[PDB]
Design a protein around this ligand. Structure first.
Ligand SMILES: CC[C@H](CO)Nc1nc(NCCCc2cccc(C)c2)c2ncn(C(C)C)c2n1
Lengths: 248, 313, 826
């Protein structure tokens, strides 16, 4: 019926990129750069947050089936955003994406687009569509962060602080392979779990079950704390390695 | 596995003929070589590549893979023309969207004059269609183009809705820019005629109502060539748009621009006095001018006319 | 775009209706006969009918009634067309000049309505106060006959009873009263209402409902001396008037359905009834005197008078002369005698009016080697079925060959100097368990005979029960000599086997000329036949020999010879068979994208397929590969009645809605999608049901060619007997004739003031489109009949194109010459 789009962390050491001699750090760097490229390109074009994420998800999924040494990343990113626009009904002309990508990429980077940037991008759509197996619909942590937050009641300002802090964590998790490891519902919970720990907020009290310490279980059944902690660790590593710190 | 779409070759189907001329390509009838199952292949031509893979097709692939209901046409897989190896750029071959084959289309059954619908047949028809619309509308997908051409019917009596291209999601709480000119003139709601770009899911109910009246006369109800002439025919029957029945008609762009000849009074019940009352109540509610007062799909299923129909029979 | 020309060669021959009254003068008795689109006015004399006037109308005549409102000297005529054009007409003669006056007119079509099952009904009040029309289920439309209603404005009264069978205005009521038989789930019932012009609604009617025979068919209004109504069914005749109820159920009428009735005596003592087997009955009203001096109905009697042609309409005329109007056979004048003849009959035929009847099939053949060609038609049904040899003289010389059984298909085999004709006769399940024919007919009067003994379907093990009295069709292949039309041989096909298709041809390397028949096994239980045969026969030395049989899994609706191969359509499939050196049919290739492959035509390697829906498809045989290829299909949905190929790019079709259309290859070739779209470039409302298209012309070719602007010749036959001709024009000749039509329509006065452009508009219940690509030749040929002032008026300010004189101003005489050459194609 539908394909499975989630792999285990251990499986990531066997991406085509890894097996063509790319080391883990490099693939991770390439992944963040391609994601931030999609993120930055679409933002300049005024795109809805879902459209950016959808493009990023396609991109992350693509390089589970292909190698970064044979398919340039910024070309791939541009194609992902192009299809994402048509999928999520925020369409853009390919020429406009190229225009923006040229504004943001230096001369070396834009070299990936070759002599005819538009053609190189439009040509990949066939491959992208086959690679994503034509499973165009994608759900993102955003909608669940809001669906779950709407059922939290208490101090308006404390809950809003959690949501924005968590929303920031979602945007940051798009730079990681978490999109490939855990369903979006878990991500939304994981980001709530983290924001709560950082703000010293005890989310349980705002639930309809205020003595249910495991508040997530009323939102997402069968999620061990282990998974939420693993996700938290992965989100925090990006903040520790970069000069950027936790939003708070 | 069954989910790895886009890789299987169209070699696996014996093409039987061309069933129709489509939007994004031509539609062909075909027999599966392995199972002997009759299918219908919708050709997606990206050889034009003006904007690549057509969006109309992208809507039908995104939505019909999510929607599984008896009365919604099933997309079975996507297959490709022979793909040359080692030149991923050079391939311009087309993809084909595999659907189940439905024997006839309602418009063809009606245009050829070959069918007769008793009251019970119209019940079985509408119950299936509207139950399917409920499934799609409950999933917040709007099938903006609903015509006779798009309602397919098997000899079994099963009705399935098709051509879900030109279909988009609707946020229940808010509204975004919408296309407005989104249904065929004969089956277009009045709101869209007056230029509403925030269309309700009720746009589809109006079309299915137009069909409900069509099934009792064998003729479409509102036949016009121009948007104004259409509003006039709707007004001769349903009454002229005016705040008395449609308060927000004045917020719509072309309300002052597009007046009918008169401020007609509603005659729907009189001109349709031959219809059974259970049905006439359904028609009258479905063809209500105000999008907010027009019945929903669920309400049509909880009508004296469609509620007690057994689809087993 | 394409350009074509359509003319009538033979006008409709079938009587669709007949009424009598005092229309031309208050003094003369007139018989008005209505053939489709044609009105014939006769004057009754003791010697016979005297024709006086014939007019055409731009519409199919649905309602025709004569009424005399108070103040008028003579009867007026109401006519309603099938396109809902209503009008009131008057005959006015100024000395020698005869004209038909349009007194009132309008179109009574409703924007919303469901056309009724039993068709348009029109009746008029005895006091001539209003016209009643039943056009849609659940509605009754009233045109009040007030002096001011020159536009025939009308209103609708809601009618609870949705399924109405028949209605009449009753005589002898205080208010206008209608009597109708209706059907609901509880059976059929007779009910009455009163019609109020002041209140514009129904009021409770004079007498109660009575539930009547399940198959009650007709309502007869009874004159004021008796009053009330008589209801005729399949088994019983009943009279209802208030409390009085009578019922006679004579066994004689059970045998055949009664379809028509007319009043012999104005007092209503004597009525005439006819049935589908052609019998003519007298229905007698026996009257009983009352103590009050009042006259009451005592009893009803039915007396068999004799046999007539199967009649759609009957009119009593004068003395014993009755006019028999038939659509399935020849119309007649018969005399009713007081004394029976030595055979027991009171009916003696006087005159026989030719009706080409239903033309089921036809072929053109040069019997006498003259080069002219003659038309042999399968005409009529049942006992009135016959073959008709039709040849040009200006008046067509027509020889009639009675077959007394239904002819189905005809094809000519010159090698054998004879015709093959498929036929079906009606036999009835008898007490023996077999069947018995009602009347001897061609298939039983053959010189030599044979019957199929095929064991293909003998497996059986599936039942089909028979009840005594049930009708069956027995199908035969008739071998008929081309000079004498003697039935030389008759072959009867299997029980429950229908013969649907027939061809005469050689196959492969086989030098023998064969008759080949395609059949279907028809069982009442099956929606679609699932068994069938292709049978190869040889007619040699007075005997038909079965050569080969091929079993198929469906009905062989159509076959055609295809470059030595046999092209046959079995249900959805279109198949090409080869004829082997072992004298057996071998399948070469198939095409399966069809709902039902009703009609086939070929030219070269191209095939045109006609479908029950989805109209026409252009196939091609690809000899390099040994299979078919779809060239182009007409996606617009149409229900086909016949198809023909005009040339390698243009294709002609006939719809079940009485419309003709032409499709062309899109000849753009920019995209494969355009190639596969046959684009309808011609639309034309013909007004007749076309059963058969056939290439040829009846005109005598003097063997030396003389040029005519028209190129090509396709003949067609219709249900009402019309024989028409389609031909193609150059763009210029079309524009000239088209431009002239527009000029002629402004000048010519139409009966009923019906717009010509409206009449010829493509029309289904769902669509109405303006005609295109067709010249109404019958309008063009009318230039020669309009007065000189009008001829010059038509030709004013005219030019021309694609000529020696690039733009040519016309003289009235210039056009007279052009039209007269156009009259020479038929
Ligand atoms: C937009 C194109 C047509 C318009 O009707 N839509 C259409 N039609 C179908 N079948 C009905 C007509 C069958 C037929 C036509 C022509 C010739 C013969 C022999 C048969 C159908 N079956 C499945 N699908 C899927 C792809 C949605 C279909 N989509």
């Amino acid at each position: 019926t539908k394909p499975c789009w989630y792999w285990d962390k251990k499986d990531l050491a066997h991406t085509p990129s890894q097996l063509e001699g790319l080391d883990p750090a490099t693939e991770a760097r390439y992944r963040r750069e391609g994601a931030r490229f999609i993120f930055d390109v679409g933002t300049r074009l005024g795109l809805h947050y879902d459209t950016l994420a959808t493009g990023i998800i396609y991109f992350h999924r693509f390089y589970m089936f292909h190698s970064f040494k044979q398919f340039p990343r910024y070309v791939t990113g541009a194609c992902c955003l192009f299809l994402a626009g048509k999928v999520e009904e925020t369409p853009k002309k390919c020429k406009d994406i190229i225009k923006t990508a040229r504004s943001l990429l230096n001369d070396v980077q834009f070299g990936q687009f070759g002599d005819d940037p538009k053609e190189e991008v439009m040509v990949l759509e066939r491959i992208l569509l086959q690679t994503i197996k034509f499973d165009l619909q994608v759900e993102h942590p955003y909608q669940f962060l809001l669906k779950y937050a709407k059922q939290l009641k208490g101090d308006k300002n404390k809950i809003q602080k959690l949501v924005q802090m968590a929303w920031t964590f979602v945007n940051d998790s798009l730079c990681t392979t978490l999109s490939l490891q855990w369903e979006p519902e878990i991500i939304a919970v994981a980001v709530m779990y983290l924001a709560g720990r950082l703000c010293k907020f005890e989310i349980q009290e705002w639930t309809s079950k205020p003595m249910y310490r495991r508040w997530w279980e009323q939102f997402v059944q069968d999620v061990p704390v282990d998974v939420l902690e693993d996700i938290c660790h992965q989100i925090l590593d990006l903040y520790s390695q970069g000069k950027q710190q936790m939003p708070h | 596995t069954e989910s790895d779409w886009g890789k299987r070759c169209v070699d696996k189907f014996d093409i039987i003929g061309i069933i129709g001329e489509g939007t994004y390509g031509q539609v062909y009838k075909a027999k599966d070589k392995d199972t002997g199952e009759l299918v219908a292949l919708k050709k997606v031509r990206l050889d034009n590549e003006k904007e690549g893979f057509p969006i109309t097709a992208i809507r039908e692939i995104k939505i019909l893979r999510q929607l599984i209901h008896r009365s919604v046409v099933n997309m079975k897989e996507i297959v490709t023309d022979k793909q040359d190896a080692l030149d991923f750029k050079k391939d311009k071959g087309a993809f084909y969207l595999v659907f189940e084959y439905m024997d006839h289309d309602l418009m063809g059954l009606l245009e050829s004059g070959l069918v007769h619908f008793s009251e019970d047949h119209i019940k079985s028809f509408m119950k299936q269609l509207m139950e399917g619309l409920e499934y799609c509308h409950k999933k917040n997908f709007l099938h903006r183009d609903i015509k006779c051409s798009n309602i397919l019917l098997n000899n079994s009596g099963q009705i399935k809705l098709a051509d879900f291209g030109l279909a988009r999601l609707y946020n229940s709480e808010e509204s975004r820019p919408y296309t407005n000119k989104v249904i065929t003139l004969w089956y277009r709601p009045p709101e869209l005629l007056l230029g509403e770009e925030r269309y309700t899911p009720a746009i589809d109910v109006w079309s299915c109502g137009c069909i409900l009246g069509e099934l009792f006369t064998k003729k479409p109800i509102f036949q016009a060539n121009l948007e104004l002439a259409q509003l006039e025919l709707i007004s001769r029957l349903c009454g002229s748009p005016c705040p008395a029945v449609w308060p927000d008609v004045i917020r719509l762009p072309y309300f002052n621009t597009m007046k009918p000849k008169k401020q007609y009074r509603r005659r729907l019940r009189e001109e349709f006095s031959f219809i059974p009352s259970a049905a006439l109540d359904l028609l009258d509610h479905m063809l209500t001018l105000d999008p907010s007062k027009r019945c929903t799909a669920e309400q049509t299923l909880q009508s004296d006319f469609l509620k007690d129909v057994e689809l087993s029979k | 775009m394409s350009y074509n020309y359509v003319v009538t060669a033979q006008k409709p021959t079938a009587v669709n209706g007949c009424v009598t009254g005092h229309f031309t003068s208050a003094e003369d008795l007139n018989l008005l006969i209505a053939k489709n689109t044609r009105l014939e006015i006769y004057v009754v004399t003791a010697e016979g009918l005297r024709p006086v006037k014939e007019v055409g109308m731009y519409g199919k005549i649905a309602v025709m009634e004569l009424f005399r409102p108070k103040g008028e000297s003579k009867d007026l005529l109401f006519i309603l067309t099938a396109k809902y054009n209503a009008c009131i007409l008057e005959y006015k003669q100024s000395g020698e000049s005869i004209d038909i006056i349009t007194r009132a007119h309008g179109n009574v079509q409703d924007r919303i309505g469901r056309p009724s099952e039993t068709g348009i009904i029109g009746i008029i009040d005895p006091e001539c106060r209003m016209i009643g029309l039943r056009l849609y289920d659940g509605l009754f439309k009233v045109i009040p006959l007030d002096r001011d209603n020159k536009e025939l404005k009308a209103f609708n009264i809601r009618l609870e009873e949705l399924h109405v069978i028949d209605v009449k205005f009753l005589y002898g009521c205080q208010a206008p009263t209608i009597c109708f038989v209706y059907q609901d789930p509880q059976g059929r019932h007779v009910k009455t209402y009163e019609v109020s012009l002041r209140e514009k609604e129904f009021n409770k009617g004079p007498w109660k409902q009575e539930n009547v025979e399940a198959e009650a068919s007709m309502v007869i209004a009874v004159p004021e001396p008796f009053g009330g109504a008589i209801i005729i069914g399949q088994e019983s005749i009943t009279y209802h008037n208030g409390d009085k109820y009578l019922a006679i159920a004579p066994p004689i009428i059970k045998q055949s359905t009664i379809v028509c009735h007319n009043r012999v005596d104005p007092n209503g003592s004597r009525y005439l009834l006819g049935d589908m087997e052609g019998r003519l009955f007298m229905l007698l009203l026996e009257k009983e005197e009352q103590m009050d001096g009042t006259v009451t109905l005592k009893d009803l009697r039915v007396e068999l008078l004799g046999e007539t042609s199967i009649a759609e309409c009957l009119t009593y005329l004068d003395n014993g002369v009755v006019f028999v109007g038939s659509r399935l056979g020849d119309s007649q004048l018969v005399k009713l005698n007081v004394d029976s003849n030595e055979q027991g009959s009171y009916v003696v035929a006087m005159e026989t009016f030719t009706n080409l009847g239903p033309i089921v099939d036809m072929c053109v053949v040069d019997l006498e080697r003259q080069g002219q060609g003659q038309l042999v038609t399968c005409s009529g049904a049942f006992k009135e079925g016959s073959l008709r040899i039709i040849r040009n003289g200006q008046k067509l010389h027509i020889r009639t060959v009675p077959l007394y059984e239904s002819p189905r298909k005809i094809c000519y085999q010159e090698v054998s100097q004879c015709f093959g004709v498929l036929s079906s006769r009606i036999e009835v399940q008898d007490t023996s368990g077999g069947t018995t024919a009602l009347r001897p007919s061609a298939s039983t009067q053959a010189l030599s005979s044979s019957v199929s003994s095929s064991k293909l379907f003998s497996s059986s093990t599936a039942p089909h029960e028979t009840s005594f009295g049930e009708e069956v069709e027995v199908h035969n292949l008739l071998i008929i000599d081309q000079h004498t039309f003697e039935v030389l041989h008759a072959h009867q096909f299997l029980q429950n086997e229908y013969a649907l298709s027939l061809v005469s041809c050689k196959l492969g390397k086989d030098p023998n000329t064969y008759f080949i028949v395609g059949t279907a096994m028809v069982y009442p239980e099956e929606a679609e036949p699932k068994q069938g045969r292709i049978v190869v026969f040889q007619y040699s030395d007075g005997k038909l020999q079965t050569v080969a049989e091929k079993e198929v899994k469906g009905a062989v609706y159509s076959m055609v010879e295809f470059n030595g191969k046999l092209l046959a359509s079995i249900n959805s499939t279109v198949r090409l068979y080869e004829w082997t050196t072992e004298k057996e049919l071998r399948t070469e290739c198939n095409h399966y994208n069809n709902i039902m492959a009703l009609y086939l035509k070929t030219k070269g390697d191209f095939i045109l397929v006609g479908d029950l829906m989805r109209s026409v498809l252009l196939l091609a045989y690809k000899p390099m590969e040994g299979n078919f290829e779809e060239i182009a299909r007409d996606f617009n949905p149409n229900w086909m009645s016949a198809v023909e190929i005009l040339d390698d790019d243009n294709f002609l079709g006939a719809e079940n809605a009485f419309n003709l259309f032409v499709c062309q290859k899109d000849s753009a070739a920019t995209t494969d999608e355009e190639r596969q779209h046959l684009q309808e470039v011609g639309l034309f409302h013909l007004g007749e049901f076309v059963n058969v298209f056939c290439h040829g012309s009846l005109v005598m070719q003097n063997l030396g060619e003389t040029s005519t602007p028209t190129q090509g010749s396709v003949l067609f036959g219709t249900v009402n007997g019309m024989i028409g001709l389609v031909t193609s024009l150059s763009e210029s000749w079309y524009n000239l004739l088209l431009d002239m039509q527009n000029r002629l329509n402004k000048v010519i006065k139409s009966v009923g003031k019906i717009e010509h452009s409206f009449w010829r508009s493509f029309h289904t219940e769902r669509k109405t489109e303006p005609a295109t690509g067709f010249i109404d030749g019958d309008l063009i040929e009318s230039f020669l009949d309009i007065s000189r002032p009008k001829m010059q008026e038509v030709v004013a300010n005219l030019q021309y194109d694609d000529g020696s004189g690039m733009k040519r101003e016309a003289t009235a005489d210039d056009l007279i010459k052009v039209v007269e050459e156009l009259t020479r194609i038929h």
